[PDB]
Design a protein around this nucleic acid. Structure first.
Lengths: 160, 167, 53, 65, 83, 141
RNA sequence: UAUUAAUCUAGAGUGUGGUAGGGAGUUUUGGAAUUUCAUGUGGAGCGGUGAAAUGCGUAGAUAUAUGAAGGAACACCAGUGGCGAAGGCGAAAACUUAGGCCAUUACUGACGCUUAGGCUUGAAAGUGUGGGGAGCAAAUAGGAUUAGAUACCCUAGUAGUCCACACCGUAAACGAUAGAUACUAGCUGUCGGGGCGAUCCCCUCGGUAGUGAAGUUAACACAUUAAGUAUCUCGCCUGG
C-alpha cells in the first residue's frame, strides 16, 4: 500500500518521542538527506567499516524513520491496525489534538479512538480487503486509479 | 437409624459354636426387631488382632432404638469371645429418597462403550460432548405492566465521535 | 521397592524409598510449633504444586 | 477419571467394594493422593473413612505391608 | 427427639399453620426444655449455652412484641407456663 | 416489561434513590429501578419535570405486593450524563427544617434543591414564589 | 417524621422436602512409635559435636528376637480444602445437641439492625485441691566454646507439659480492616445445593480464592467478600 500510494508509512513501531515533536523529525529528515547525498559519493573509497556503517544507518533510518521524509507539517491523520501493541502513538494522539481512525475488534479502549472500526484483524483476508478499501479511499484525493471499492469480488488468498 | 453391626468371633473356631455364640449374644438386644441372620464366612485378618490370622466376620442389619445398643457395647468389650463390635448408623454420609438411586445406567454405558471390542474404536473416559439439550432451571419469571408512563425517549448510539472535514 | 528381581534397579527405587522415609522423619527429628508445622506443610505443598505445574 | 465419579452413586458400603479400595492402595499401605484417584472432595474423604474403618476391622494392614 | 408434630397439634390457630406465633413459642419452649436437660447433663457445652441464649432471646422478643401490638396475644401463657 | 432477580428496598426513599443515581452516573447505566413509594414517585416526578432525567415508569404485577419504579437518565451522544453532582442534606438520623429566608440555593441558582413543605416536593424557585420555607432533602446539579 | 387505627408481604423467621461438613461435648475401642523391665545371643566399645569433651559400659551395655507395663501425640488421606461468632476443630466408633445452604408453589404479620449497662465463651503460661507422671524439657549441675558466656552446642534433672474440680480473662485473641443495609465493569480456578446428563462440560443460588477496568486512598495498595458508593448504631482517636 505504501509503494502504491505516495503516503508516509511506519515499518517498525514508534519508540516514543518521534511523533510528539517536530524538531526530532526535522533532524531525522536532515540526517536522511545528508546520509543519502553523501553516500552517493562514498561506497568503496575507505575501509569496509565506514561504508557498512553508512549502509547500516540507511537501513536503521528505513526501520524507524523510513516513511517520514515527505512531510513538512505534523501528520493530520493516521490509520492504526490495533490500539494494542501501538499504545504509545495513540496516547500521544490523545495528548495531541489530531483525529484518530483505527481498527479495533474488542481489545481496545473506545475512548482513545474517535472513528471506531469494529473490523476483526485476526483473519488476514478481512485485513487485506479493508486496507485496500482505505487505500482506494485515499486514492481519489490525488487523482489516481481505484481498484477495489465497488468490485463484486472478495479478496481470497491463503495465509503465507 | 440403620444398624450395621460388624461382629468378630474369637479367632479361628468352628461354625456350629460360632452360630451358637452369635445367637446367644444376639439375646442381649432389648426390644429391636427386624434383624437378619448373616455370616461372612471364614476370612483372613490383615494383622493379628490377638493371636489369630483368620476368623469369622458377621454383618447385622436392622433399625430401632438408639438406646438398645450400649448394653451390647458393654457386654461385648469385657468378654473375650467377641473381639470387635464395629457399628455403622445413618450418620455415615448418605442421601436417597426415590430418585437419586436409579442412575447406574451411567456406569453401564461407561463399561459398555469405554472398552474397545473393535481395533478401530477409541472412546476416552474423559471427553467432552456438550450434551445439554433441554432443561435449564428456568429463570423464575415475574410479569407486570405499566399504568402511568411519562416522557418516552429512545437513544441508539453513544460513543466518542467528532465532526468531519478536518481543515 | 520391597521385592528384588532386577540387576540394580531395585536398589535404585530403594533410594526413592529411603528419600521418602528421610523426608517423613524430617518432621520427627526436631520439634517446632504446631502452627509453624502446618505452615511448613503448606509451604511444602506449594513447592510440590510448583513441581507439578 | 474417578470410578466414584463415573457412577454418581454418592454412597459406598464396606462390603462388595473392597476391591476398588485395595486398588487405591499403595504398596506401602497408605492412602493414595489426589493426583491419580480423581476423587475431588467427597468421594475422597468417604473412601478414606471406609479404608480407616476397614483398617480398624483388620482388612488392610496399617504399616506392615 | 423434639417430636415437632405434637407441638404442631398442640396450639394450632388455622386449618394449616406452622409459622404462627403459638407454634413458634411452643416449639421454643420445647427446645428450651430439651436444651436445659442436655446442659444439666453436661456442664461444658458452651455452644449449647449460646444456642440456649439465642432461643430464649427470640422467645422474649416475640412475646414482648405480641404483648405490645396485641392484648390477648399472651393467652397461650396460662396454658403454657412462661420461662 | 419483565425484571427478574428481585430487588430490595435499601433503607428509605431518598438515600436509596440518591445512591442509585450516583452509582448510575459513575457506571453510565441507562435504567435504574427501585421499590415504589409515594415519596419516590414525587421525587421522580420533580426530577423529570425539572429537565434532569429521562423516562420514568411505575409498575406492579397484580397488586401492591410487588410494586416498583424505574427510570432512565438524560444523556448526550458524547457519553455525558446531564447530572454532575449530588449531596444529601437530610439523613435518617438528622432532619433540618428551615424558614423562608433560610432557603438554600445550589451553585448560585444553577442547581436545584428539592423542598417539601405541605404539598409534596417542589423546586426552590417555586417555594420562594409562594414564600413557604420548610425542609430540604438533597442538592443536585 | 412522632401517635393511633387498619390493611399487604419485596424484610424476617417458621414449616415442608433436599442438604453439607476436623461443629461441639460425654462414653467406649485401636494401632504406630518411645522408655523401662523380663527372657534369647552377644564381647569393647556406646552416645554425642564444626572439632572434642561431659555422660554410659565387662554387674556383658548399643545391636537385635519375643513379650509385658505405661502414659503422651493421633503421620498416610491433609489440599490456592472444609467447619464454627471467635479462640480454635483432623485415630475409630456409640449418645445428645448447635447453626448453615437450596425450591418454597406453606405459614404469621414488619415481629428488622445495632446495642450503653449486664451476661456467655474466650490460645498458651501459672495459681489452689488430687492423682498419674513414657518421653519433652525454663530454673539447676557438669563438659566444650569465648578475653569473659550467668547463651547458642552436648549430657544430666524438678516445676510443668496429662487429666478431674473450682480460678486466671491475658495476647500479633490479624484480614493489624465493627456489624448491617442495599447498589457499582469483567475474567480465571475450587467446593456445596438444583436440573439435564457415561465422565467432562452447561446453566442457577451460594461459600471460598486469584487476576483485573471505573473509582478511592498521600503512596503502597484496595477492587462486588471494597480501604467504592451512601445510610443506622456502638466503640475508639487528639503531639511525643
Amino acid at each position: 500500500i505504501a509503494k502504491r500510494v505516495d503516503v508516509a508509512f511506519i515499518t517498525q513501531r514508534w519508540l516514543g518521542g518521534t511523533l510528539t515533536n517536530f524538531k526530532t523529525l526535522s533532524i531525522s529528515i536532515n540526517k536522511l538527506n545528508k546520509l543519502v547525498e553523501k553516500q552517493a559519493e562514498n561506497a568503496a573509497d575507505l575501509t569496509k567499516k565506514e561504508n557498512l556503517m553508512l549502509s547500516r544507518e540507511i537501513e536503521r533510518l528505513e526501520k524507524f524513520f523510513g516513511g517520514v521524509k515527505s512531510l513538512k507539517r505534523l501528520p493530520n491523520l493516521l490509520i492504526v491496525d490495533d490500539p494494542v501493541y501501538e499504545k504509545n502513538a495513540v496516547a500521544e494522539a490523545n495528548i495531541l489534538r489530531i483525529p484518530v481512525v483505527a481498527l479495533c475488534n474488542t481489545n481496545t479502549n473506545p475512548e482513545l479512538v474517535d472513528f471506531i472500526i469494529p473490523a476483526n484483524n485476526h483473519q488476514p483476508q478481512s485485513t487485506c480487503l479493508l486496507m485496500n478499501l482505505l487505500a482506494d479511499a485515499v486514492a481519489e484525493a490525488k487523482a489516481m486509479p481505484t481498484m477495489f471499492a465497488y468490485k463484486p469480488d472478495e479478496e481470497i488468498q491463503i495465509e503465507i | 437409624m440403620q444398624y450395621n453391626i460388624i461382629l468378630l468371633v474369637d479367632g479361628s473356631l468352628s461354625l456350629e459354636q460360632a452360630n451358637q455364640v452369635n445367637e446367644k449374644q444376639q439375646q442381649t438386644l432389648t426390644n429391636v426387631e427386624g434383624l437378619q441372620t448373616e455370616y461372612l464366612g471364614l476370612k483372613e485378618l490383615a494383622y493379628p488382632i490377638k493371636k489369630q490370622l483368620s476368623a469369622h466376620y458377621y454383618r447385622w442389619k436392622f433399625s430401632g432404638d438408639n438406646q438398645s445398643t450400649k448394653d451390647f457395647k458393654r457386654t461385648a468389650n469385657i468378654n473375650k469371645q467377641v473381639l470387635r463390635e464395629l457399628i455403622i448408623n445413618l450418620e455415615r454420609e448418605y442421601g436417597y429418597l426415590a430418585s437419586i438411586n436409579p442412575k447406574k445406567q451411567q456406569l453401564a454405558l461407561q463399561k459398555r462403550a469405554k472398552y474397545d471390542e473393535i481395533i478401530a474404536r477409541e472412546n476416552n473416559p474423559e471427553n467432552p460432548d456438550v450434551p445439554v439439550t433441554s432443561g435449564l432451571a428456568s429463570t423464575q419469571p415475574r410479569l407486570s405492566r405499566t399504568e402511568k408512563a411519562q416522557k418516552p425517549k429512545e437513544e441508539l448510539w453513544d460513543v466518542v465521535q467528532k465532526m468531519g472535514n478536518f481543515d | 521397592e520391597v521385592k528384588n528381581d532386577d540387576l540394580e534397579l531395585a536398589l535404585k527405587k530403594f533410594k526413592r524409598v529411603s528419600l521418602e522415609i528421610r523426608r517423613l522423619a524430617q518432621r520427627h527429628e526436631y520439634h517446632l510449633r504446631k502452627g509453624m508445622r502446618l505452615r511448613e506443610k503448606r509451604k511444602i505443598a506449594q513447592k510440590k504444586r510448583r513441581k507439578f505445574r | 477419571y474417578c470410578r466414584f465419579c463415573a457412577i454418581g452413586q454418592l454412597r459406598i458400603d464396606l462390603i462388595d467394594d473392597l476391591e476398588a479400595l485395595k486398588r487405591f492402595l499403595s504398596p506401602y499401605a497408605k492412602i493414595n493422593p489426589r493426583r491419580i484417584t480423581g476423587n475431588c472432595q467427597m468421594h475422597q474423604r468417604h473412601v478414606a473413612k471406609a479404608l480407616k474403618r476397614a483398617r480398624y476391622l483388620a482388612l488392610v494392614p496399617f504399616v506392615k505391608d | 427427639q423434639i417430636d415437632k408434630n405434637g407441638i404442631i397439634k398442640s396450639a394450632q390457630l388455622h386449618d394449616k399453620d406452622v409459622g404462627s406465633i403459638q407454634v413458634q413459642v411452643s416449639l421454643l419452649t420445647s427446645q428450651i426444655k430439651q436444651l436445659t436437660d442436655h446442659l444439666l447433663a453436661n456442664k461444658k457445652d458452651f455452644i449449647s449455652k449460646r444456642g440456649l441464649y439465642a432461643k430464649v432471646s427470640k422467645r422474649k422478643r416475640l412475646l414482648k412484641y405480641l404483648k405490645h401490638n396485641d392484648l390477648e396475644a399472651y393467652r397461650n401463657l396460662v396454658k403454657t407456663l412462661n420461662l | 416489561i419483565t425484571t427478574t432477580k428481585p430487588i430490595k428496598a435499601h433503607f428509605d426513599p431518598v438515600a436509596d434513590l440518591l445512591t442509585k443515581i450516583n452509582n448510575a452516573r459513575k457506571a453510565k447505566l441507562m435504567t435504574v429501578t427501585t421499590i415504589a413509594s409515594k415519596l419516590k414517585i414525587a421525587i421522580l416526578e420533580i426530577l423529570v419535570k425539572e429537565g434532569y432525567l429521562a423516562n420514568f415508569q411505575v409498575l406492579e404485577n397484580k397488586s401492591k405486593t410487588k410494586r416498583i419504579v424505574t427510570f432512565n437518565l438524560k444523556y448526550t451522544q458524547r457519553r455525558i450524563p446531564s447530572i454532575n453532582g449530588v449531596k444529601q442534606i437530610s439523613k435518617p438520623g438528622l432532619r433540618i427544617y428551615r424558614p423562608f429566608e433560610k432557603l438554600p440555593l445550589v451553585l448560585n441558582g444553577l442547581g436545584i434543591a428539592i423542598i417539601s413543605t405541605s404539598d409534596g416536593v417542589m423546586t426552590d424557585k417555586v417555594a420562594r414564589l409562594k414564600k413557604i420555607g420548610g425542609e430540604i432533602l438533597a442538592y443536585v446539579w
